[PDB]
Structure formats: C-alpha cells, structure tokens
Design a protein around this nucleic acid. Structure first.
Lengths: 49, 48, 64
RNA sequence: UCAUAGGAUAUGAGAAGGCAGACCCGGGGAACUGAAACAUCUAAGUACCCGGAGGAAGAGAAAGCAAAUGCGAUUCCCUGAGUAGCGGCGAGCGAAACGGGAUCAGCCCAAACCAAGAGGCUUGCCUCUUGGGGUUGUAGGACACUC
RNA sequence: GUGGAUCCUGAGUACGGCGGAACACGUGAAAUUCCGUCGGAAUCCGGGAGGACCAUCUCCCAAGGCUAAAUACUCCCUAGU
RNA sequence: AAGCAGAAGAUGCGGAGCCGCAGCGAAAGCGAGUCUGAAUAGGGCGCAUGAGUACGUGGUCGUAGACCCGAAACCAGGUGA
RNA sequence: GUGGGUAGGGGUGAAAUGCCAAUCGAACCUGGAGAUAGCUGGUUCUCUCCGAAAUAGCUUUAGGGCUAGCCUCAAGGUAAG
RNA sequence: UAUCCUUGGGAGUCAGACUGCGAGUGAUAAGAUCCGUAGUCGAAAGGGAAACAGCCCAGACCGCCAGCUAAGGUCCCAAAGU
RNA sequence: AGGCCCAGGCGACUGUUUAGCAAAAACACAGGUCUCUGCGAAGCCGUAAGGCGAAGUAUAGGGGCUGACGCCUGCCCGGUG
RNA sequence: GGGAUACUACCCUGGCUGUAUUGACCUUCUAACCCGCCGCCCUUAUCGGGCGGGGAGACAGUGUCAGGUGGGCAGUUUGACUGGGGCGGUCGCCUCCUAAAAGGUAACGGAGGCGCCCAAAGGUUCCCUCAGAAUGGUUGGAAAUCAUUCGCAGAGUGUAAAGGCACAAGGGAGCUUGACUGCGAGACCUACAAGUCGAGCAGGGACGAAAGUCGGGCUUAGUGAUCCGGUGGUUCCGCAUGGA
C-alpha cells in the first residue's frame, strides 16, 4: 500500500498461464558425468544412488 | 468528424491497420496499397 | 502461520536469474488508435522493476 | 350401539432433571473489524441460542483414487504448498491425489425362488413369521449339477 | 466348483428445470454433494464416474444398514515434574 | 519431517520431502543458450566472472491483540412496570 | 391503597423526544471483546562514535502514507570526488 | 584537499521560524503569506545587544586561583584610558 | 380569612404536559369536515394459532385535518397523489 | 402467344366438414380445500373433533417461482484545495510572464488555448515569393479583377502563445501512399508508472536519372492505468485419450 496511490501490481497487467502438464526434466551437464568410471553403464536409478 | 477504420485485404484476410477518416470527406470505402507482414509483400488494403 | 504469498502480484511478476523481477508494460489494454506506432512496439516488449519499487516489493514475492 | 374415537382397570430398575464453562454432531445464527470509505467479499459458519449422545463422537469398506507391468475400508500426523485455483482477480481466501508413518475387521439385510401356516378366492395377484436366500462388477445370486 | 433357458440385484429413486446452500471454487468453462417446488428414466444388450459436454478407453455398481484402533478433551482421582 | 526406540532428553533409525548445482519463453518446447523476430541481423534475459544448504544469535518484516492505556458506538443473549 | 399486564430494531405517551428503577434521539448486565481508533497521553540503566529533515511527486490527500532527497552501518570499486 | 560511486541492512523526516538580498500578493503594511539564494535557530551552551532562539563574535572531551584575543567596551554601578 | 379598575393580543372554557430549567399562545377538548370499512368489516399485535376492534354492526368503528359560539370558507385538476 | 400442364398422382390455387388433443365465458356436484353456520355426541367445555344438514367451491388459502409497488424498516454514501469553515471558484493537458542571463522553482499570482482537424492542410520530385502602399484602368469602390514600381518580411506558417522559417518550415504542379513491418547503438527526463529523440540494420516499397528523402502534419497541446468483456488471426495449451 502506497498511500492510496493505485499500486504497482494494479498498474501492471497480467501475464500468461501455466499448464497442468509440465514436464520439467532433471538437468545434468556433461561435467557431472566425469565422476563415473570408464566403460560403465549409467541409469537414472544409479544416478539416484 | 473522424472515425477509426480497421484496414483489411482481399489478397489475404488477416489485416491490422488502424487509421482515421471523415465520413463527409470519404463516404466511399477507401483503398490503400500497403505492406502486409504475412504475405511478405506489398498488397492492396480495403477496410471493414 | 506460514506466510501467504500475494497472488495478484504472483500472477504478474516472474523471478528471473540474478534475483531481478520480470514485468510487463502498462498502457497496453484497449487504447491503440491514439498512440503512435513507435511507443506501441516499444510497449510490446517487457521490462524490469526498478530499484526503489524492488526495495518495497521484495518481501511480498519471497516464495517465487 | 356394524365400529372406531374416547373412557375404565392393571402391569413397567421407562422418561423427566442435572451435569466438566471441556471434547462431537446437527438445527438456527450476527456485528464490530479488514477492505486504510462501502454494498460483493472478509470477519465466520466464529461467538451465541437450541436438540442429542458418547467416553470419545463423527467417518468407514469404493456407482473410490487414478491413468500404470496400478492401488485397494475409514480416520489421524509429516509432506504436497502458500502450489493449483478462487477472488469489486481487490482485501484476502485456499485445496486434493500420488509418497512416508500410527492403526488395521470386516460383516448383516430387501429382492428373487422353496416350504408350511397365514383367505381374500378374481384359486395365488397380496398376506405375515420362520428357515433355507443372499449380498455380488475382466458380474453375482436365484436356477440344474458339490459337504 | 461347473453350466448360464429363465428370474433378481435398493422408483417418485437417480437426473433435469427453477431458487438456494456446501465443496478452496463468489455462476463462472462449473464437475460434484445437499436442500425446497415442479418434472421425471434405465434394469444387465443395464447403469455411474473420470471437473462443461460428446465418442473411445479405464474404474466402479448408488438410491439398505452395522463396524473396534490410530483421534479429540480434563470436572475429576493417583503419583510426580 | 512425521513416526519408531530412548530419564518428558541426548542420541540411533527413519531419503518421503525440501533447496541449490541452468536458464530462456505465456506455452508447446529448446538448452549455455533461449525468446522475439523472415533473419545465421539486432535486442532482452543468468552467459562466460563455479557456491549453497542446515542450525544458532542479532536486526527487520508478515500473521496473530503484537508497544501500553483510552472511546462514542455495533450485534447476540439475558434482567427489570 | 392493594393485586395484576404492557420489555428495548420494543413498550408507553391529553405528544415534551417525555417516561421505562437518580441513567434514555434508543434502559441495565454479560459475551463477541484485549472491538477499532491515520488521534491525545505514556514508554524505566550508562558511556562512546556518527548525525538528519520539515523538500519534490502522487494520493477521498492535506496533522496520514509510499517513493525520491537528507542519515547511519557493512562490503566492494579504489582515487572517480 | 580527500571525499566520491555501487550494493545491502536499519531509520526518522513531509507543521518550520527568523535575519540579509532578489521577487510576487498586499496599500512595495505587518513578528503577514508564498518563492529563490545565504546564514543562524531548529539540533548550539559561551561573550556582547539590560533581560532575549533566530542580530553580532565564537563552537563546550574534562581539569588549572595560566597567557593572548573576536564582537563589544575602558567615570562608577561594572573590568579596563576622566 | 379578595387589592381593584380601564384597555389589547393569544387561547373558547375546567383540563394536560418537558419527574430534576420551559405550565405556555404548546397538547387535549366538545363541535366541524374529509376519507376507509357490509362484518372471518376495515385498522392493529403476532410468522402462526390466537386475539383487540367488539360479546359492537354505517345514528358503528378506524384514520387525517381543523378546533366552543357567531358570520363565512373565493379561483386554479397544468404537476404530484 | 411462352411449356395449353390431354390416361404418375403434383404441392393444395388453400377451402371446409367428421376424429384426438389445448383457453377463456359457462352451470353443476360429489370430490378435494374452507366455513369466527346449524343439530347431535365426545363432554357438567363458545377449545377441537366425529356424524349429519347447509353455504361456498376448484375459487380461496397455502408452497415454489416471477413482476410491480414499497423511507413502513435496515446497512451505508454524500470529495478535496481553501489565508477558519459554508457559499463562490478550481481539479487533466499545452504556451508565455512571474523566474533572480544553465535546468528547476509556489500562491484562490498575471494572460490564452485543448478533449480536434487534415485522403491531403501528408511523402517525394520540380518550380516560385509575400503584406502593404503609389499610379492608371468602367461594372468598380475604400477595397472584387488586371498592369507597373517600391517593398526583410509588416504576410503567411490548419488552430492558442512562444520559438523558428524566404537556401523555405510560405505558395504552386505531377506522382504516390513511409500516416510501412521487425527492430534499434545510444541519449534526455524522471520516485515509480510513464513520456521524448535517435543514427544505423533487415524485408519490401514510393518519389526522382542519381545522389538522396520518406517510420505523418513546422515544433510544443488534441487525452487515461488495471480488471472485465466483445472482434479478427494464431505454427500455444487444452484435466484418461480424441475433440470441443
């Protein structure tokens, strides 16, 4: 509240939506892959462990 | 007195331009040759 | 009581990287025949909340 | 004076009323306040009033949750999350399921059909009390073949 | 346990209109639950839901009941802190 | 965390969950790039100039009556001819 | 005189806004309720360091509030001043 | 000469007044009002102008029975030149 | 155990009223007028049963206005009802 | 005269009768509903309640929905500046002075304007030049229209004032729609929200041979947040899936 002056969020309009279907993928970059040894198999489960 | 006019085109229907006109001075449906973005070329525009 | 966010501002601002806020522009609802094209196309683009308003606002958008 | 109302007699560790200002269900149900006024909204289904029982009450075994080599009664706690949403889209209001824990009980009818007795007869169209007759969804039970 | 000719599987009921209530949800794209008035089905080849609604697919069988424990609370009483 | 053991404790178990390490766009989505845009142009956005989490003190804020006293007044329930 | 009735979003009233238990333009008591109060009053031990403003803008705003200016503290940039 | 910028934490302030000078309004009236600019008070005690916030001189870390001085003053009250 | 007289407003009069500032020219009043109501009257209290009206019946009730008595009570239905 | 339509069986050119349904006017009764009507009984009872008679009667009342009326009643609103308030005036934007030779700077200080207009009063290309006065000339002049001379700007510049403009920004002619899309290095101003300029880049133009100009008016006014809703396009999402 700024003294009855019609506040900033009111002066600003609204933006777009969001969707119920949103597949945020688990990010991993290549530098994290160097920890595993040579010739090994990596799976999401082993990533979890 | 001046009325807003929204321009339209036959060579493609979706048009966008807003202009002004006097109903005494141009009672007739005006035409103008303009550049539509989606046709990517200059086209002839009527209004609604 | 865990503190409530403010939904009216949560529907209008986005927390970008480096902690700033992404906001839309005003004057883009229903008057367009009277404004020049230049200000309209500048107005289409987005902007960022200034420092003083951020100093006021920071609390009210604490929970992204 | 068909017969009922009503009336009379007897039998009833029957009810009422209180209570812990607590806790739970219902019925009824505000305003101040906030919105920097105010009517939508909020306060809040709060206080208060009424009725009822319990030592816990409600709820409870899917016309569910969900979208998968799927879970299998309720309830309650953490999480979901101040998220999705709702809202003079203001002020504010605001979830659920998946996951993890406490606990863990699943059952009984009505209907079909049979048996008698229960009469009206318009000979089963209905009696009413037993037992079989049974509680079921990639259907089950009556129905003909099983201890 | 098998078979499945035939019979049963909760009617003024679901549901709909109108006017309200509760669902976080203020009628809104408004499902769902209940109230009052009026209307008003289906019967296993049958019905209900999956947030308007319709087709496919999945789940389920309402309009009948009962059900302990995890739960809430202290006028009390005991022993303590 | 809840919870389970444990002197109303510590501590042990308990990875569900939470927050970062990647952003960009309303989104589908893409990715150290993304969006806008016809564009390999320009511009915006963290680039590249890699620390957060958990807990304690302190300062401040929010929701609670929130720094202490103060109304006239409103509503509900009762009590009085 | 005695015994009765009329109860406060009311009753009464040969009518004044009178009276309804010394109280009446809405009686008294309790509860909501620590109502709210942009207003007035108050706010308790010491020293050291630094040290303001009474302006602009906007406001159903004028004795109120927010931002900017002015202050303090901390970390950087360092030599821009 | 050393104070400037950026970020972050935490404020109070939105009633100002007077004296100069430059303007308004006023009757070139007001200890009037409203501006710009400078100072003081505000938030600054000490000396002077009798007493006195804004005028003049000058800034209080304490102590001394030390000196020099600014405004102002030196017959006395009352310190210093009848 | 009466002062009196002469005039003039105002109110016919006796009456009533702001307990606790105002007894008055204020209210009431008899009279007048308008209007509603055919009796499960109208009107009023109450949600409703019940009542009051009224164990009454347009010569009776309810409401509005004016206020003994004497003389009178003009014009306008454009507006509102 | 165009198809004179003379032996499918046309729609009816639209007419009516008999059959099954719907609304008002009608009269009735049981038969609902009602009776502060009467007789009997419950019952020594003016309550109600059983029978009978009667009267009304599908009306009423009552329930739900709807419209009108409705200070009888309830919650509320009724702005601010103000040389005390009320009353008067004003509230936004643009121009000048006040303004103290940068910018800024108040008052219920002093003067005006604006809530438009212009399909050309734009954009390019090309070409000019005013107002006024003197003298002649008729209708004709105080000025209508010509001719000469003087004439820095007195005239215009759509409109208020200010600034600037005759190398046009003033006037005239041709063509045309740049009064384009995507932008935008930077820069001013500013509390924020806003507002303003901008070279240059890309695509496609217009004018001109070209250089080059053009993202409206000669500059400054001619105008409003958000929410909500309408309209057009969408390579966006759309609650199991596919659509909506």
């Amino acid at each position: 509240f700024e003294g009855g002056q019609m506040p900033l969020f009111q002066r600003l309009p609204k933006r777009g939506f969001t969707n119920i279907n949103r597949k945020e993928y688990a990010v991993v970059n290549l530098d994290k892959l160097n920890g595993f040894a040579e010739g090994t198999e990596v799976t999401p489960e082993l990533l979890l462990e | 007195m001046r009325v807003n006019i929204t321009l339209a085109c036959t060579e493609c229907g979706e048009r966008n331009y807003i202009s002004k006109k006097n109903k005494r001075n141009n009672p007739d449906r005006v035409e103008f040759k303009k550049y539509c973005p989606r046709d990517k070329k200059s086209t002839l525009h009527r209004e609604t | 009581p865990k503190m409530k966010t403010h939904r009216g501002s949560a529907k209008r601002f986005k927390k970008t990287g480096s902690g700033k806020l992404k906001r839309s522009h005003a004057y883009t609802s229903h008057l367009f025949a009277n404004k020049s094209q230049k200000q309209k196309r500048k107005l289409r683009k987005s902007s960022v909340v200034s420092a003083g308003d951020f100093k006021r606002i920071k609390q009210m958008l604490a929970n992204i």
